[PDB]
Amino acid sequence: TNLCPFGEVFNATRFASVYAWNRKRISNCVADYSVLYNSASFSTFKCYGVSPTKLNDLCFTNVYADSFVIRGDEVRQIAPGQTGKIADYNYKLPDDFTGCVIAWNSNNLDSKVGGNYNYLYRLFRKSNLKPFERDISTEIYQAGSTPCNGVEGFNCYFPLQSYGFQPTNGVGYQPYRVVVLSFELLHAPATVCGPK
């Protein structure tokens, strides 16, 4: 009986930026999903394609944990069939998604007196992201009618802009840390199951 490394993922000191979401592959371990649901820290625990109480009763080949940090109002965009900057150009869930999304406030952990500007998100992209697709290229985006030869200009914008996380800002702008647990049974063998 060896528990999965949920503690490292959820209690990591630093969370990767949303534009390049951190991905962790969990397998060959027993996962105690009941512990996550029992904790009241998580503000949002929307689950798609399965009921949380029955979650420990099903087995999956791999569990992909996608960890990032997004502002309060943009956590809504983390849902199948949703539109927005985070949904389209940063992290796109498939319409047929079998998994859960967990989000909790992290105002004290992230925001500072001067403001936490470390986290940054992608503003522009030529085409909408396919499900579970991540792009970290920083080519100078072109808005059309002129190529800038990779030089910032009027219609040529750098794709990445940094969040301003002030300590006393509104609830909408406060930093919410989000982990998306996607359960995938890729083929016949299954290694992840709940405790007996």
Partner: antibody, heavy 133, light 108 residues
Framework: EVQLVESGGGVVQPGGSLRLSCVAS????????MHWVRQTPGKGLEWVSL????????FYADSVQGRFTISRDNSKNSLYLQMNSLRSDDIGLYYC??????????????????????????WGQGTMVTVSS | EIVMTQSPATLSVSPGERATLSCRAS??????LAWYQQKPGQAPRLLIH???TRATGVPGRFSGSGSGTEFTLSISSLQSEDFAVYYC??????????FGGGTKVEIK
């Protein structure tokens, strides 16, 4: 075409208060750093106020930094300028604008960030305010 | 902080002739100076974004040139539709943006 329609400006006695509201049609202002630009009749265009994409970082002109306050509402697609204690120098048309994105400081922009591509391609119709007794 | 100055105060030039407008800046701009034209009764519209890159929907007669401290706007041919006031705005890194004085283009 992409449009900007403003309202709320009007004649007022000196020392009064006015609020200007500019509404954006046929596009989104979520990321762009919108400007308020004053064109005094007989004078060239004068940049007055700026707001960031998320509203966190707001800049003002040296003359009107004390009084004017700019806010934005992305959900309602609106820009509000709360003028206070108007002076004789503030008598002129006021234009909404869509400048380039204001990049908050980050790894790529360490010294306080930069304003990239702040050319006003989209201009509103204008709402003239008058400081008259 | 920086000052943008247009050398031509007023250019009364007959239609069908090249027009030259000179814009000078206090600090090195590194080709970040747009141009605007304003006909009476209308809001000024973007004409040339960047030092010389012509903008969308602009006839090819308008051209830009120069870099660094000095920039230039050249009208290849002057028509009855080219009478307006021209301002050379700058969009440098910091947002104390400064416009230009303006040039008066008049008939004959």
């Amino acid at each position: 075409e992409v449009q900007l329609v403003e309202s709320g400006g009007g004649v007022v006695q000196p020392g009064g208060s006015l609020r200007l509201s500019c509404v954006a049609s046929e596009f989104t202002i979520d990321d762009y750093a919108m400007h308020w630009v004053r064109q005094t009749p007989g004078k060239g265009l004068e940049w007055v106020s700026l707001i960031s994409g998320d509203g966190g970082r707001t800049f003002y002109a040296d003359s009107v930094q004390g009084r004017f306050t700019i806010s934005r509402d992305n959900s309602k697609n609106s820009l509000y300028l709360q003028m206070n204690s108007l002076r004789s120098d503030d008598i002129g048309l006021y234009y909404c604008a869509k400048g380039g994105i204001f990049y908050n400081p980050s790894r790529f922009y360490y010294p306080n960030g930069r304003l990239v591509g702040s050319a006003f391609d989209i201009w509103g119709q204008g709402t003239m305010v008058t400081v008259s007794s | 902080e920086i000052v943008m100055t247009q050398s031509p105060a007023t250019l009364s030039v007959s239609p069908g002739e090249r027009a030259t407008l000179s814009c000078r800046a206090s600090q090195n701009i590194s080709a970040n100076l747009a141009w605007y034209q304003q006909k009476p009764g209308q809001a000024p519209r973007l004409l040339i974004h960047g030092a010389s890159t012509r903008a969308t929907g602009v006839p090819g007669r308008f051209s830009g040139s120069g870099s660094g401290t000095e920039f230039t706007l050249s009208i290849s041919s002057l028509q009855s539709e080219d009478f307006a006031v021209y301002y050379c705005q700058h969009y440098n890194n910091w947002p104390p943006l400064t416009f230009g004085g303006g040039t008066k283009v008049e008939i004959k």
